[PDB]
């Protein structure tokens, strides 16, 4: 019903990641399979001026487990952005999410 409250510095990075998602999602399925992720990293890496290494079905697997919460070989829009959140924390971006006491 209600969504959390993230800082303006967080969404700022989540926006650029949103376009990159659909940029590869041609099937419009809303999930980046091990294949769709193969080339995705190549671009996602360019964001940091990286060499844009070309991994394989194996490497992509270890990367999928990080983003994907179900590790079902599919990273949803919400499952992908999160991957950048963990990095944004160390990158120098303050983020806050609605967390209550269990």
UniProtKB/Swiss-Prot annotation:
Ca(2+) 4 binds at residues 68, 70, 72, 74, 79. Residues 12-47, 55-90 form the EF-hand domain. Ca(2+) 3 binds at residues 25, 27, 29, 31, 36. This is 10 kDa calcium-binding protein.
């Amino acid at each position: 019903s209600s969504k959390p409250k993230y800082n303006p510095e967080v969404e700022a990075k989540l926006d650029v990641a949103r376009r990159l998602f659909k940029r590869y999602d041609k099937d419009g399925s809303g999930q980046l399979q091990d294949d769709e992720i193969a080339g995705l990293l190549k671009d996602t890496y360019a964001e940091m001026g990286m060499s844009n290494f070309t991994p394989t079905k194996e490497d992509v697997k270890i990367w999928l487990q990080m983003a994907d919460t179900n590790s079902d070989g599919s990273v949803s829009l919400e499952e992908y952005e999160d991957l950048i959140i963990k990095s944004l924390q160390k990158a120098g971006i303050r983020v806050e999410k609605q967390s209550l006491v269990f």
